[PDB]
Ligand binder design. Structure first.
Ligand SMILES: CC(=O)N[C@@H]1[C@@H](O)[C@H](O)[C@@H](CO)O[C@@H]1O
Ligand SMILES: CC(=O)N[C@@H]1[C@@H](O)[C@H](O)[C@@H](CO)O[C@@H]1O
Ligand SMILES: *[C@@H]1O[C@H](CO)[C@@H](O)[C@H](O)[C@H]1NC(C)=O
Ligand SMILES: *[C@@H]1O[C@H](CO)[C@@H](O)[C@H](O)[C@H]1NC(C)=O
Ligand SMILES: *[C@@H]1O[C@H](CO)[C@@H](O)[C@H](O)[C@H]1NC(C)=O
Ligand SMILES: *[C@@H]1O[C@H](CO)[C@@H](O)[C@H](O)[C@H]1NC(C)=O
Ligand SMILES: *[C@@H]1O[C@H](CO)[C@@H](O)[C@H](O)[C@H]1NC(C)=O
Ligand SMILES: *[C@@H]1O[C@H](CO)[C@@H](O)[C@H](O)[C@H]1NC(C)=O
Ligand SMILES: [Fe+3]
Ligand SMILES: [Fe+3]
Ligand SMILES: [Zn+2]
Ligand SMILES: [Zn+2]
Lengths: 424, 424
């Protein structure tokens, strides 16, 4: 039950070669860069981006690259990617795009410089899709009383691969649909299984093709060699994005990168350490049960050793919050294979209930395991609101409830600065 | 302990632009084709191969392709790959390489047509390397009273990545060193961790580059979209090669391929079902202990479901033989996490003790776990001798013993045709 192509939210902006499917993301490691992306259908157009700060009227111009691609019998429009760098912290900027022809204007606010007690509020959306439910979820996030300043996307964007030949037109519609948000505030991308799009039948064998062309990330900023895993620092948070569907065996590029990246985290500069991945390591629902075991046996010990605060995942179309637990004492024949409470371990949260194609995962493992703190099969999104270097407030909002109602509220105590039990 | 560059085995064949590092491998699914590979140092040369059988002296010519590559400050020679097809079963063929300049001649015997009771004896070599120990291992294989007709190589070829800048010259020496065998009988390649060669420091970020240029495989024959995993049928055996260091999460290329491939296995046509991978799923040695857990949680259930006979792995530089066990009843909180004997499960064998750079893994998990049937820290190789559709004899030969001494022998009873307890 996705929204029909004639839906108001898929409407195409008027004007000749008008920029469409506009979206932004952090373009550097510390937050003083932004990647501006958009598509033009009528003709190539300019890849220039004109921007200026609200205060200093000095208008500047940055040039970018343009690209195109074909999936099966599908031909893309003209995709533009431009990186604006050397921006100023905590300041509003205006940027215009589509200079040569029909011009459209947007704005964004750079984050404050990275610091120990710098407050910031992140949005959490996963497996959004483009169904009526998806629109409701996006609305609640926009109307949220505690305004979100950046969204952390945990995977499965458009779900265009459910249509015949993965009808890439559904990638375009999703681009216009989400523009109302991603054009004004950055979204941090995480690749999900619906982005793999491995279709040998139609001779499309390169994983993540549509996705990688449409969405760029500043992976090079963290010494990564691939766009499916990277980290960025923003305000008081250090965010690490992992790829559930890439190699992660010992010696592999992702494995090597993650190992070095954790050593580089400085809790004195960024107290909150967050990890994003599409498939959850802890999940008590029947759908995709134990799918995350493979990655868990490889990185769990590291998450505990470095005391990461929270791990966000999607994939399971529902909501779940775990107690701080670890299962790293197993040794094949020592029988220690039951998850135990660990104050050094992170809290795992499944938040992939933004809407997808309108289906909710209800069937859950019974009885509720001990490692599961709270769970519910309802659509919605979440908010991770950072206050101090010691306190962060997380909340989950349902689509049935009012915009300001928090069906689930939890205070997180930083594992590095305030290591006290924060169970609920 | 690596053999010095002046060692006799690394001798470069005389003659202008003489073909060197000649090696062959199966070129199709059933064995009526061969991929002939070689290198020329003085100049490109022809990529043609002239071949003929003992009977019909009819000489034919097949034209292949030539390619080169660079690593750091290393420049490869001219690499040639030619595929000879439509060969006749169980017949001896002669083939010449380097037609334009100085020609060299070799021979090989195609396997018999695939059948239910077709006998065939495979060799098992893993983590060969090029140390003095490596030369001994290869010698014992050549002198084996029961001559091997094809080698199943379980990973880690040259170990050139141990030298500064992975001195690719060490790939060339290894090519000349092993030529005395691989040029006369096929070797089935499996990629190991030393083939990854991920070296960002020197701007070499493409995994498996040196390896993939030098060693080609008939992966397309099995519908695979990558040379790191594929299968082949030879005599009464259906061999499946997996990549321990590639993506294998649900929905990924490898995962999808394996799932489909197992369905296509016909025990009525090829009774023996063998799987190759570099990292052992069961291992009681300290070195690399539990590294195979990630892939294990992914594919173990399938191996049992389809009753694969034997799984061969290397990586650990020693020898180990498990009993038929399985650890697939685990459900996170049900406590069933101990391996149990299973007559439907394969026997796991690790033979990565061919030599490498002269180091052997002697540290073992004490006491010996119940799932481990035999283990020993000695250099050697193995032989898998198929008799009928019901019986196959496996033997392990140490380098200290005589060429005909079997330090460990075991009869394998086919899991499909002769489902009886073959424990020792
Ligand atoms: C292939 C080549 O040009 N040889 C040189 C080698 O002699 C030198 O010691 C090394 C140092 O980095 O660089 C190159 O590999
Ligand atoms: C004498 C000799 O061996 N040189 C020939 C050269 O003349 C020719 O152009 C080339 C083409 O394959 O083959 C050899 O290199
Ligand atoms: C693309 O190809 C499919 C083939 O199944 C066809 O049904 C569809 O109409 C085509 N779309 C366009 C507009 O090319
Ligand atoms: C749109 O911009 C292109 C690129 O500079 C230019 O060639 C073309 O004349 C413009 N079209 C319009 C809106 O007139
Ligand atoms: C989506 O939500 C917006 C904001 O509430 C609304 O204006 C629009 O009509 C909705 N579109 C659909 C198709 O539900
Ligand atoms: C963090 O916030 C909490 C409540 O929002 C407050 O009680 C606490 O003192 C703050 N951290 C500090 C010590 O400044
Ligand atoms: C390698 O072994 C062969 C016998 O198979 C022998 O002729 C040769 O001398 C040996 N070379 C080295 C360097 O050990
Ligand atoms: C299998 O081989 C063994 C010894 O090689 C023999 O005893 C047995 O009878 C054979 N079975 C068949 C199918 O002939
Ligand atoms: Fe999803
Ligand atoms: Fe090895
Ligand atoms: Zn998913
Ligand atoms: Zn290895």
């Amino acid at each position: 039950r996705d929204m029909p192509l004639d839906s108001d939210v898929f409407r195409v902006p008027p004007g000749y070669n008008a920029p469409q499917q506009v979206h932004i993301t952090q373009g550097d490691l510390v937050g003083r860069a932004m990647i501006i992306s958009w598509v033009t259908m009528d003709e190539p157009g300019s890849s220039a981006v004109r921007y200026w700060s609200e205060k200093n009227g000095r208008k500047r111009i940055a040039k970018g690259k343009m690209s195109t691609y074909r999936f099966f019998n599908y031909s893309s429009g003209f995709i533009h990617h431009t990186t604006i760098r050397k921006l100023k912290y905590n300041t509003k900027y205006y940027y215009e795009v589509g200079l040569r022809n029909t011009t459209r204007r947007f704005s964004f606010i750079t984050p404050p410089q990275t610091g120990l007690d710098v407050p910031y509020t992140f949005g959490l959306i996963g497996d959004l899709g483009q169904s009526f439910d998806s629109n409701t979820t996006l609305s609640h996030y926009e109307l949220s009383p505690k305004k979100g300043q950046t969204v952390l996307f945990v995977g499965d964007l458009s779900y265009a691969d459910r249509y015949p030949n993965h009808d890439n037109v559904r990638w375009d519609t999703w681009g216009r649909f989400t523009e109302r948000s991603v054009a004004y505030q950055p979204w941090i991308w995480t690749a999900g299984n619906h982005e793999i799009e491995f279709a040998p039948e139609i001779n499309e064998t390169e994983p993540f093709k549509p996705f990688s062309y449409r969405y760029h990330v500043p992976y090079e900023a963290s010494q990564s060699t691939s766009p499916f895993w990277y980290s960025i620092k923003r305000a008081s948070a250090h965010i690490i994005v992992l790829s559930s569907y890439s190699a992660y065996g010992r010696g592999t590029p992702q494995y090597t990168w993650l190992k070095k990246e954790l050593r580089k985290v400085k809790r004195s500069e960024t107290p909150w350490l967050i990890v994003l991945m599409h498939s959850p390591l802890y999940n008590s629902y029947n759908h995709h049960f134990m799918e995350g075991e493979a990655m868990r046996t490889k990185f769990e010990a590291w998450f505990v050793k470095y005391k990461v605060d929270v791990v966000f995942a999607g994939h399971v179309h529902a909501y779940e919050r775990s107690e701080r637990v670890s299962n790293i004492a197993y040794k094949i024949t020592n029988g220690l294979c039951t998850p135990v409470k660990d104050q050094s371990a992170p809290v795992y949260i499944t938040i992939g209930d933004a809407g997808n194609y309108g289906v909710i995962d209800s069937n859950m493992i019974q009885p509720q395991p001990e490692y599961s703190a709270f769970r519910e099969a309802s659509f919605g999104h979440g908010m991770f609101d950072i206050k101090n270097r010691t306190h962060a407030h997380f909340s989950w909002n349902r689509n049935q409830d009012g915009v300001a109602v928090e069906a689930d509220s939890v205070w997180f105590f930083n594992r590095h600065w305030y290591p006290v039990d924060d169970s609920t």
